[PDB]
Amino acid sequence: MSIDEYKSQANESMANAWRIITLPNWTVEKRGTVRGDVVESRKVEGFGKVYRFTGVVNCPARFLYEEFKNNLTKLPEWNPTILKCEIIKEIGDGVDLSYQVTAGGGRGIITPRDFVILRRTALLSREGRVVDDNPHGYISSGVSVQVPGYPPLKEMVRGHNKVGCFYLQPRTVQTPGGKIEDQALFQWLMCCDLKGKIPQFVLDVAFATVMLDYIVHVRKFVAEAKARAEI
Predict the structure, then answer these.
(1) 200-227 vs 61-70: helix crossing angle, rounded to 10
(2) Are 193 and 43 in contact (CB under 8 A)?
(3) Which of 48, 102, 137, 209 lies 20 to 30 Å from 173 when distance is taken between CA atoms?
(4) Locate the START domain: which residues (predicted)?
(5) What residues does 123 pair with on adjacent strands?
(6) CB under 8 Å to 87, separation ≥6 — which residues?
(7) Pairing of strands 95-102, 113-124
(8) What Cα–Cα distance (Å) separates residue 215 from each residue in 33, 65, 125, 161, 174?
(9) Domain count, the chain
(10) Cβ atoms 61, 69 nearer than 8 A
(11) Is 102 helix (H, G, I), strand (E, B) or coil?
């Protein structure tokens, strides 16, 4: 792949993720423990069933964006669902390739899987245009690609991310004690291949559980940053 082919696919993927994650009319799949946390699903032509987590995280959106953008290889340190994360190559315009190994779901349906991910990280306007400052939202998009040198392993299922992203929107709130503090609306789009003949209602529970279980670790990471006066 020319890096133009990869750069093209990163742009196409980022635009599809943003377009999807902002579509109207979703179906509730599972509500979380914290007020407002929800996994929803819907049908999207050309992708099939997609999942979206929405919830609020007690940190600036820019802070989380910069952790995902600049510190992807540190993810395993605070998120035990991520076993390994390696950058393969950075090819410009906040576009890179990575190798990621995920743990199995807390259910036995989603097994350990590894991924070869093409990502774009960017700042977006409300119209989904890339901007240099004053963003509406911060996006980190993912799609699975093939990279020679990272073949499927016989010992591990190679997952296929069809379209996905994190999409973080800045919020500033008033606390009960009257303080003004930055928070973030955290949205996460997921759309996996999962192979074989497992019933969709079984897959829907398994994916919504994966997404709620991940958010626990995000909240823990944020709470430790707050404790240390990093935010």
Answers:
(1) 110
(2) no
(3) 209
(4) 24-227
(5) 131, 138
(6) 72, 73, 96, 97, 98
(7) antiparallel
(8) 11, 15, 25, 19, 23
(9) 1
(10) no
(11) strand
The angstrom resolution of this structure is 1.8
| Amino acid (one-letter) located at 120 | R
CA atoms of 143 and 7, how far apart (whole Å): 12
Exposed, middle or buried, 59 (CB in 10 Å: 0-12/13-18/19+)?
buried
Decide the pairing of beta strands 113-124 and 157-158.
parallel
Query: Rounded to whole angstroms, how far apart are CA atoms 194 and 30?
Result: 19
Closest among 151, 121, 155, 118 to 135, alpha carbons compared: 121
Q: Name the experiment that determined this structure.
A: X-ray
- Residue 216: phi and psi, rounded to 5, are -50, -45
Residues in the chain: 231
Give the tokens for residue 82. Answer: 């991520």
Q: Which residues pair with 183 in a beta bridge?
A: 171
Instruction: Read off the tokens for 231.
Output: 């935010």
**Cα–Cα distance measured from residue 77 to residue 75, given in angstroms and rounded to the nearest whole number:** 5
Which amino acid type is present at position 50?
V
